[PDB]
Subunit: 489 residues, 4 copies
């Protein structure tokens, strides 16, 4: 049988922007993302689906129903985030004792007096409502991982349209150290007010996707959608500093563990002679970032420095895994291959013959074992599988996907990796950014009209796993690939 450690917890992850809106009074118009998906030109260009967040699941108002269902499903841990924009919707006076021309931000002064003054600008209603949501979460015995940032930035810090047009004279988001500075303070502020409810903290969610899709993969429809290798590096550099500064800010107010959540992929060799391509890919997509916030090894400009203000700023690693990424060696570097991992046809099969989701992502459980063990053997920091799921409205593949990946986590634990939990990507369907509501990742189906929640069969399977703290014998057969004969090719 496949039983998990006694302290191991099964739960779910969720994002504010993707799930909060939907109920009357929940509208939040002050984020770059909100403006971004409402933009006429982005819609016309098809960069965004046309669906609007205002028509979401309504977690902001129906959180009790969400939590109650999670409880009935036997979940014991949850990771959510606070929307910076709801806390500080209005512009903060330009901070002094700060030079924006300075490339590095080695420290941000945070003390009670600063927090007290910052508190005067905060939206108490939003702050109080969050406390209510989290109190309900905790009163139900659920372990709580508080994440500080999940993509949207308050508009007074980033006007995505301005930047998309090539105008860099306004709020430029992660392109400005002003954002780094304010994020550190913001993180400290939240921890200062919610520490009594939080068990573990996370500074941000998938920072690599933010800078990657925002400035390079512009067809993905992510803000500011300005194509530039150089600005992408600047964004990633600043987000790395932001993390470190946020880590110190939180630690000034709390003793709780502080980690980060990253977007992962299992790099697989097309051929047995592509092993070196894998390592290269792992360095460019994984190691460089973590060696920076753990080893303090970073590269600003064209020199390989080691910043002490960055070294050791991490207590745990949040692993977000969905599928693999096949690569091939090409003289100089390497290349990712279409028809595998994230680059497949929707509701079809990959070049390898494995079923793909409604999003066109290939079914590849083993990849999760690879990533977990890889992270463990390199840094030996404990971790949580903070995200794992599948866009599958019909629920044809989710049962197999759920059981298979949970099994891989079990396998990684037996190899010695310290994995303390598994959080399925979402309890209920939500807003899939540029893709809209059509991509449904929930264990619970959402009727966007009534906002009513339904239990997909896989949620009943998950209840068995959470409830028994193991993959029971009766559902072991689901640790396999969804049969492709009955599915679309």
């Amino acid at each position: 049988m496949y039983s998990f450690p006694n302290s191991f917890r099964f739960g779910w992850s969720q994002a504010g922007f993707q799930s909060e809106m939907g109920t009357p009074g929940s509208e939040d118009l002050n984020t770059d993302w909100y403006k971004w998906v409402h933009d006429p030109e982005n819609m016309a260009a098809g960069l965004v689906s046309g669906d609007l967040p205002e028509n979401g699941p309504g977690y902001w108002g129906n959180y009790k129903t969400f939590h109650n269902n999670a409880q009935k499903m036997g979940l014991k841990i949850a990771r959510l985030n606070s929307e910076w924009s709801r806390q500080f919707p209005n512009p903060l006076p330009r901070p002094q004792n700060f030079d924006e021309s300075k490339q590095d931000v080695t420290e941000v002064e945070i003390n009670e007096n600063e927090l007290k003054r910052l508190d005067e600008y905060a939206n108490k209603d939003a702050l109080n409502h969050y406390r209510e949501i989290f109190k309900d979460l905790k009163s139900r015995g659920l372990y709580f991982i508080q994440n500080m940032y999940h993509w949207p930035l308050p508009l007074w810090l980033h006007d995505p349209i301005r930047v998309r047009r090539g105008d860099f004279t306004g709020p430029s988001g992660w392109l400005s150290t002003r954002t780094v500075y304010e994020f550190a303070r913001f993180s400290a502020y939240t921890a200062w007010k919610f520490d009594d409810l939080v068990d573990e903290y996370s500074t941000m969610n998938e920072p690599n996707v933010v800078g990657g899709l925002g400035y390079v993969g512009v067809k993905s429809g992510f803000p500011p959608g300005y194509l530039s290798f150089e600005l992408s590096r600047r964004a990633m550099y600043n987000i790395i500093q932001a993390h470190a500064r946020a880590y110190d800010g939180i630690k000034s107010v709390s003793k709780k563990p502080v980690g980060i959540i990253y977007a992962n992929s299992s790099f697989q060799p097309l051929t047995d002679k592509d092993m070196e391509a894998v390592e290269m890919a792992e360095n460019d997509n994984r190691w460089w970032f973590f060696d920076a916030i753990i080893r303090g090894e970073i590269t600003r400009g064209n020199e390989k420095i080691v910043r002490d203000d960055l070294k050791g700023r991490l207590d745990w690693i949040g692993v977000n895994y969905y599928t693999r990424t096949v690569v091939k060696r090409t003289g100089k570097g390497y290349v990712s291959l279409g028809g595998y991992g994230h680059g497949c046809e929707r509701n079809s099969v990959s070049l390898a013959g494995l079923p793909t989701s409604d999003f066109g992502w290939e079914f590849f459980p083993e990849g999760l074992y690879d990533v977990l063990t890889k992270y463990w053997n390199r840094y030996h920091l404990y971790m949580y599988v903070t995200e794992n799921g599948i866009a599958d409205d019909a629920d044809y593949q989710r049962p197999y996907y759920l059981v298979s990946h949970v099994y891989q986590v079990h396998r990684a634990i037996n190899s010695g990796a310290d994995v303390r939990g598994y959080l399925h990507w979402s309890l209920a369907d939500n807003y899939e950014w540029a893709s809209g509501f059509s991509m449904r990742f929930g264990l619970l189906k959402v009727d966007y009209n009534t906002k009513r929640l339904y239990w997909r069969p896989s949620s009943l399977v998950y209840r068995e796993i959470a409830t028994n703290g193991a993959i029971t014998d009766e559902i072991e057969h689901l640790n396999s690939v969804p049969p492709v004969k009955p599915l679309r090719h």
Copy 2:
């Protein structure tokens, strides 16, 4: 919400030949079906799959595991049958006072003395084992419907190969009134020995398929596989008498309800101008048979008669429903159309765009409401949905199929139809006659190697229904058609 009457029971149906064998010591070689699927010529011709019953689920030895799982699933009723061949594997002496040339069998003398003498020929081991299986079933609080016949006939009463070759000088099964005579006695015998364990009786299962596929739809690979419209009528005539005589035999020993289980289909009009074709189909496939055993109206030779010995021989009706049958008025009468109901492509879509099972059967829940109400408004006899299910190894459609048809039963009850239960076709996969083991109808998947049982997600859904005696709000969304976009076309 969709709640069922307090006395309403949810369970499953199962056949001896399809599920019993598989464990050591369970072999039963004395049936026409056993010889039929082992026949070299039938295999060569592809009339039978090649799979053998001896390699089945092993219910004969693992019944306790079956029953325990049904209990855990919240099931409260079960319908099984005893294999005539196991009870009387050896030839019984030709009955005296019996004229096989006589066309009608208006009565069979059954009294304790006859039963006592019959008992001397019975296989006590098989009889005792059945009692153990049924005692275990009852000790678990499950209501029990005892069916007397489910297709296989003991070899001493029918050599299928002989008949298939055109030789009618040997045991000819339902072509001989000798079979009718012995069946009545057999039924009385079983009721005489198991009445203390039985709640309700059924004489036979799908007699229409036996005579229909056996003598007309010969490509189906059913014994004796001899093509003849005339012999098909003779077979159906005798099976009708057998039912009536078996009904009287059982009633001589019991006061319990005695019904019959029939293979049904919902006849749908291709066009709004095919209404008359539907009625014609219903008369030729349904009404003629039941008007015979209920109204006593039958037609022998070419004369329309009314036999008093046939009138009123039925207490309840067992409805076996899987899909619809579309018909059109044509040159002469009417015609069934391929590309609909049972005549579709496997793992595809029908001409109407509805998903088809691994068996090529079209998804059509409404048809069940049609059949139930049709039966009710004509005879007003209470009934059980004795069979409903789908060949779906992957379990992609079963969740939708299960909830949708259960909903239709609820809808029929609200129309006033007296339906007392729903028995899903099989708890676990089994031997699908000429098709072999490839067609898996179970809520539980069977590993034919280890004989181990696994819970498909739909069995977890069924547990919710059985346990709550209703389609709970959380799974209501399953009362819909399986999305076809992700499925094969």
Copy 3:
């Protein structure tokens, strides 16, 4: 480039029963096949499609249109057959000096006097019409291969329904040596009257399918449809004698070449360790038959004899190839595998990923090279590819199928095999026996309403090949597998 020998001819094959009827006055009701496809029970059982020959292409009346199109397509050879039933629709007096109980038919006396008397029973109208059709064929410069038999037998020699019912007291077709006797005389008669128009003769078409599907593969819907391994052997034994006797009969009246047309398949090993299974399959499906009519080695009863009256009765071999047959070694024998060759899903892909036709036959050109070379290396008799084609109404695969197989014939010639021609299976769509008109093999599409013919693109491709006597550079790319991405899976 791929050019063929100067004397090599490109043309087509066609059958009387499949193409003749369709025009007024062409009805031929005196064959076992005609009665067979009109039989009410066969239709009800689904053994036959329900389509009727009377509604065919109408070659009997529109032959000139057929021939003219073949001419425009550059074809220079044609193989057709005369329908025995049209010549002798009425029963002939039983032979005086013939003992039907005798197992062997080592000789049939044929002399001018016999022919003169036989001629008195012949239908001169049918005979004269055939002469007109063939004269038109020859006047157009087309080489002519005259085939004597293509399945249907006159009713006075075979009542298929009687036999199907197990009654062997009437005309039993190939189960009677009377049929063998009459066939020899018939063949001699036709050669005696058409020798001036014929270039080369063929005794029969696919005798192996006749005996194989008629008495073993009964689900195929071929007469008499009586399942019996033993009677299948008797049928094949008699058909073998019939061939030999027909060969001698023709040779008594002609000096022209006399061969036979056989149904072939390329036996492929599932694994590299199934080589012995291939040889076994080749012996049971090919060699046994030809070693009989060439080497005179046959097996009657259970002894391996060598009949001198059978030895050397063959001048050339007609190869009918459509697809492969994958086999695996099992126990002491072997087994054909579904999902390959003829046993695939319609309009899909095989287990090997190769596209399948409207008939469910797998695309496998190489198999033709295998069969041609196999035959050559064993007997060294020259041959014609008398049949090759595909059921493809849309014409999506025919272009690739045509060019690919023609290429394989070129490849076999370069290996040294003496192949003198390629006859595509049919100029125009026709009646596919039990399958009806739905399976369209024509280069020309037939509108069964108007009987009008249309040129599918592949017929334009074929014109290039015939016209240039080679696969021109411009169409070489068609020597490949039809792309499967755009096709159905």
Copy 4:
């Protein structure tokens, strides 16, 4: 039968950038498009396929082979374009007495002296080579339509990367009246040097796609890929002036007809109550542009004006049609619907059940009739179907697509529309802009390795049409929808 007017010509269209390169010495690196598809960031973002023009069909060196094949196919007309960049690869001195700040360009002085001086900057080698290509075209009796511009702009007039980055201080292509000015001169220059070879002129190809995809549909990967409704209008305004000025320039040197080629779509109503949506779409996508260059009615800034310098600048209309565009009325205006026309899944079926191409475009022949008649009834200017084709490497649908649309042209002529020719989009496969070489529109398949050309079956069908100047009876059946059952869904 469907015969065309005696003067009606069948041929093909082709673009320089898409077909010229491929042979050694044919490289043209001086265009915005060349730089655009070689850009590292565009490749990384996936805006461009990664395929490079340098690896094309090689028309620049193999034109004789192209022309010879067109001749063999019976084609009698061809429309090609000269690449501005090849003629004037180097920067021309700024125009004195020209004010770039001026919004309108009502006239450009063109006289022999100006042309003489311009000629000194021209690349004689390229000019001479073009003359050779065109002389070969004419010596084969092919009617010749000379198009002046087909998207790529010389780099000294447009640096797409600069603009994409938001920098508008450099060569801005159609955003600068300098480009308009130079285009008029360029057009006059070419006509001045090639008039003896030209039969009819076209100023530009699909100007609407240039401005539309270049500044609005940025996900299409077209230069400069800068999202801006406003700059899109400016670009279209300038391109409209450019046309008018080019028309006058050419007319100063020639008496030949001068038209324009536009990208068309047939706007279809989703419902019978969406008729007004169609008209609105037609105004926004068609009428506004043509009323400008024909009626002189244009709107600069926001002022609706009527410029006499624009009025009457058109002799004929080039219709480029591929598929429909379904629209629905929506309160204010209207909306195009995905799942129809250009917005479908690749190698699938549309929401209407019609087959889609390798490019995801829906099969809709009728739309061509709609567009032709619409244009005729409004302006009564004769036209040519300058483009019609399908991305179909396998050639499964092209035969039906070709015959069906040609039939629609015949139908439009019988309605009274003056259509003088049909030019299938490309003789051979070529570079599909941002999509690369994967989208193959050719009647002839190109092996990009050997640069060898192959005849797809549809080219044989086209030869029948061109050769007979009509859809012959034998191929009439192709005037239908490609069967979807065998195709992918």
